[PDB]
Amino acid sequence: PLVVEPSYPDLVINVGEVTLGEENRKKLQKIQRDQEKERVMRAACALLNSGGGVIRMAKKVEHPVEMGLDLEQSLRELIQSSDLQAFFETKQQGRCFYIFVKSWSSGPFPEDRSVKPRLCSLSSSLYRRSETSVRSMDSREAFCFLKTKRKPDPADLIFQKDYLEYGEILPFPESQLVEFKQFSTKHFQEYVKRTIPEYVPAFANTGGGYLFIGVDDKSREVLGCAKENVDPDSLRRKIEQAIYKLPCVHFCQPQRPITFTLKIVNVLKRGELYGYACMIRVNPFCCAVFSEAPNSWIVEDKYVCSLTTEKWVGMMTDVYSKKGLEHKKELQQLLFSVPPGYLRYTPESLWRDLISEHRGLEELINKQMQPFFRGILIFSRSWAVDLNLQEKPGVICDALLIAQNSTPILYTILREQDAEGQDYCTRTAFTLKQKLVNMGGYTGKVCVRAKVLCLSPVSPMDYPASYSLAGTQHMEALLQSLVIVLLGFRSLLSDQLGCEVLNLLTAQQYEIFSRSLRKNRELFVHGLPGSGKTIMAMKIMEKIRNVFHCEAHRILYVCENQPLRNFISDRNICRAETRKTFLRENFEHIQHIVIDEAQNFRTEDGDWYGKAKSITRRAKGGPGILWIFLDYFQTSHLDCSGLPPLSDQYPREELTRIVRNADPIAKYLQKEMQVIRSNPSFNIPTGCLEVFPEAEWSQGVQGTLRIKKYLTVEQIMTCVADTCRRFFDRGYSPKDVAVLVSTAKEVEHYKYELLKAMRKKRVVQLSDACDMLGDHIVLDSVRRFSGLERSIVFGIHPRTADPAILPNVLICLASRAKQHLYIFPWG
Amino acid sequence: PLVVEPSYPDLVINVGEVTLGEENRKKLQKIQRDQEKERVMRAACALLNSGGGVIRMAKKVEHPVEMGLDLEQSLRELIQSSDLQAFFETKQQGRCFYIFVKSWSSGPFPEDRSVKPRLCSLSSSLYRRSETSVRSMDSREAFCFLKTKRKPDPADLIFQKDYLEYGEILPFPESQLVEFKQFSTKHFQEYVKRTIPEYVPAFANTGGGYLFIGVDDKSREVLGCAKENVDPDSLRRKIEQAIYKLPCVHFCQPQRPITFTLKIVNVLKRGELYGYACMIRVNPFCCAVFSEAPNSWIVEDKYVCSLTTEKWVGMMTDVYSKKGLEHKKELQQLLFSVPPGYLRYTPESLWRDLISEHRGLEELINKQMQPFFRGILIFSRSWAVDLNLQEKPGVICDALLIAQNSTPILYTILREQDAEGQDYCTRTAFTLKQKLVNMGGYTGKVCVRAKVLCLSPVSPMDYPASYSLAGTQHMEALLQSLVIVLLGFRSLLSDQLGCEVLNLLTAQQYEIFSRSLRKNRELFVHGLPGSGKTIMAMKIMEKIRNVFHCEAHRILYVCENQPLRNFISDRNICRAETRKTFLRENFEHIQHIVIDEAQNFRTEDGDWYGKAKSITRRAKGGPGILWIFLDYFQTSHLDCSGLPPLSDQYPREELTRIVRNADPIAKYLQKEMQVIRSNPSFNIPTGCLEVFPEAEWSQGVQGTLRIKKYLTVEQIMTCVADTCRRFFDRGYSPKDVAVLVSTAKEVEHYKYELLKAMRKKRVVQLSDACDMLGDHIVLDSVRRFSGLERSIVFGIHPRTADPAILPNVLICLASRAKQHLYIFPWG
């Protein structure tokens, strides 16, 4: 049999002894030549259908030889092209001959999904009547045939007869619908058995036709087979069983069997019976009829296996991340930008951590990277875990090199030499390559070379020169496939990519939303939880500056909360102030005003709404911009806010698509908003909450949502410390974490008890929400964090004085977390 | 040389006497068999590349015969498939054998435009190196190869030597870069000439390589050619000339020749000169190299012609109605809807006119149409003129039948029998079929039969059954192709299709525009001329009814002009009134108000804007909708309108895309809008006209723009009556025509002056603008017609009493015409 050799970072099939050279292969018998050809073609088909690999065959001579014309032609028939170089490249060393196979189709969503077939095959086993001949459908023909089937006569005059005269001349030739057959007397019955499988499917697949057995092909005479040698009823049984044995597939209901008419008619000579003529009429079949199982091969687990008929049809007709697929080029430019003239190390934070922790690692890597002038080196604690494999103790780190004039190399750094190290690195490189093709959709020639290194002071297969990354185009295509693969697993780089995907989604929505600036002066923007409301507000202020040509200090932003204004003010895109500062101080020189989280405002201090109306109207270039962002789902008190009635808040723009939280958090927000819909506060006008998230919208970003009820305070706080330490080990920064509690009065207690457990985990700085620019964790209340967001958020013990306010708290909490959310409720 | 038979409504190629049957073609000499095959294949390739047709062969025998397996296989190679049935169908009667060919690729923009090649070929003459063999690229391979080219070693050790030894073994085998060839024993220079085109193109197309002439293919021994047999310098000259004779096509700058190094090296024998060896190193070539001109054929005029290298490459590497193609399904369902169970005559106005004019025409057509139980019969004065051909006097009408269970038939009706009648009908049917395929992009099997009929007292081919329209899908696909064909010619149905295209464009822009109904309550809609402002106003009231669930009478429409008020009222979508009626009567029962042409309102009667606000913002379901449609380019007077200041007119929508006038009219509108902007009216607020139309927006609808300056009143009126009579003869209704005058005081004068000429033309009814439903030519002033549209507009002597309005009046005139605009300015 054929089995993949496991010691390699690639699929490598050993086919054994093969005779190579056309002169040598001409001296073989037909049987042995065909058997060696079949082994090699099974291997090449399997590697084409499974992401590529290497065929290894032992050659019986020492000197370089050519492949042989018959093997060449079989490879050409496999790829349906004379361009062998595109998929097959051969090397030979000593007594070893290697063929390097590229994948046929790469990824779940190739560009050519409707253009080229999913699989290569040795044969499709689909036959078509092609005028007077029967021909087998190549992969492209069969692809088109099934793609068509999936969508939602004088001969009959002869067939109607109940007897035939011996020597009768039929008045029609063989044609698209007619086929005449004659057989020798002794073998007639076995010849019929072998005939049915090749002509019945061809008629069924094409439009039907008549198969006349007992008619001379050339003269069209009726001859039949002698009575003594044929039993009509046994013949009928045999033919019918052969016909029903044919494998049929369906794309419809009802899935009825092949329909045909079988007639065994009498052949009369001089008025006496001589023999029997068999006539089959084959109606056109609704779907595809195979003569047998297709001859297509794939690698699964470790065995080269043959696809079944149904699996083959499924593949020939029909976590993957489409947001990654769509944004791959932008994401690659952001994270894995290829430097022009030096080797880049990423992530820089993880690299610095590793070099600080381990002595001599810097020198080791620098010495190992001398040959590679340009490219990128991507580090990790364990690429194995990054790919959902098992971790190996003793692995300092893994690094993936993607440099010019080199193949991809996966380095594994060990503290001390190990026997299992090379196996671990090989498994990791093999998985990485298979993902780069089968998930990342890479269509080039790719290999990952596994290389173990030891910090304490089988040969590698040589690939053709076409497997080396020759420059920017290849490196960028491979890094975009790497982006798409990383977005399918949980890891530091997959989390950075997910954050950038969220940013790109927000930018799309903002481009849709910013077209209203030229159309409005007064606007009430009703956002939903996690709709980017604040990001739109900032980008709108920038757009106002650019369009109206007014200086930044002429644009004003008003919010309820000090942390939020602090955050907005540090942008230097406008003047930012609070409701109280706004109501107190004078702003006559201000032309444009933006107001956010207005539903949290209060009427105690004064009529901020009227003040802003006046300030904006008295602007010189007509009335200025007065945009009031608000979200009633995130209300923070039962009092009135000073907003005009719901019927007065016009014109309106609604931000309904969730673009700021990953998929789990978004689903949680969607579910939880129904509680607020069920019981809203009385300060909320009734009809406002009848805004619903877009049903067709998803973020396509992975995240973590964990509910950890039934725990005590010290357990919560130790768990938080453990999780933060794990993230910091994986490479996250503290400035990606925030801890949110019910009220600002409990902030001091929870800070103390968090530092009590953090002093065991090597970070001793917790900051309030009023500072967000330093590299430290943020602890604060849910409410004081309104308008801010962090990648990882710890939600501790929701609590408020009034039931009428409690329902909001879960939404106002979960909406603060971009990717990872941990909830610790009371119980 | 082959020629098209001209007596047919199709492309028919008569290839002469052909031997058919496998048993008959097996008895031939190979030369005769191959010559017959070449003739048939040239015909088939030409018909594939030229829209399809028929090949006629004369078969030497009386009885039915299969085509022959070599002919079948050549057709399979031609279409690169075994599905011959899709393109080739064969019939035979007596001593005639027909092959009906379907077009390979049809239409200017096929669905498969970028995936399948435009041409079928007998040979591409493009060769690629495939390991150790040279292979010709089929059509699909050559298509992909040319796309790739269009988008923007141990052998060298031997090659470096300057002498070799007889019997030397070259230490490397043949490979993708190396070819071993022996010299011929007989004719050496001729052999080298023969072999250079076989190998130099393949190396040049596939990365270069080495060709060693004089090296045994099997033993790899150096043999060379005897010294006395060839002369090295003449051999070099012959090789270089053969190389430079190779056709090449470039897709790049510069267009450099083929690059190579040619070496003739002495072949010693025991240290003495015995012979010569030829070494060619062929460098990779930037573009395609042909061994000879491609073997592809096409029907040009009356000749079957071969395509040149450059014509073939252009065809392979790459009026028409884009909007027709985009909306063909909707346009077909509007105009050419095919009913279930009865034959439909269209256009019915033209049909009625024809039967009224001619005695017995109804009887003739109804008699002819008995056989057909379903379909559509499309009449015309002259389908030949519709298709840009020449008219034939004596032709009553042409009808195009498209009925179930029948092929298309073009009928020509003559008053009296004529010899040229059948020729005229055949030429028209040929043009129609070729257009349906090559221009309308029909991909099925199509033939248009040509029949002549008379009102007073070569046999057509019989097409396969697949050429008859089986049912709804075939009839609809064909009618959708006819839609695209018609939209490229100037005719009555083409003008109706253009009107419906403008309606589809308006509906799309309205789908964009109507999203503001949820988001605004007060809206100022600023439309440009021809931007469909009134259509939006009507359709948005239709939407207000559905979205506010109120009855129609709750909506109020207010405009300036009585004709427009009437046109709106007669639709029963709302209550419609005038500004003057509005400012007097009671309307507080109203919830919603839409104001149109508000720029033309006047202040002297009252505060209409104040009344509108007051009525709307006191409705029960909150403030009502108050949308105001205005167009500052279409200002009719220089006084005050009563609108709020431009700085106040928010929120604001803009309709900047012209969707109501054909392309010439729209361009003329833009050119006049430029004049307005250059010299704006003073009563308009300052920044209004800085609205600009969509730069790239086009309607793709053909129209008529004619300016007949320096005419007299008599000439103008006679020309108007003459053009009206021409249109009415062609089939346009009177109610497609409007005659517009500069001022209303001239209306009765010009009514008299018009009837004075029109009574010669057999129509007696004119109408004022206040009746747009009557089937009459509307004569009225530009001012009174503002807000109304008609297909044909006659603009007479436009002018203003106050100079500023001079270009505004021209714009308000032009914008009224949908398709045909005739202007008669001042002398």
Add this chain to the structure above:
RNA sequence: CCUG
């Protein structure tokens, strides 16, 4: 297509 024929024969074992």
Add this chain to the structure above:
RNA sequence: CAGGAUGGCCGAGUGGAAGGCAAUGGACGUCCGCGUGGGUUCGAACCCCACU
């Protein structure tokens, strides 16, 4: 799974059109032709492939 198909007929020829019952396939010394169509070869009846 093997073995076949040659000129008028019988039959010899597996890589440089016998013989037998003056010639006794053809197109224009080159080429095609040994069931048909292709391929390799400097060279094919001869080797390879498909088809009948």
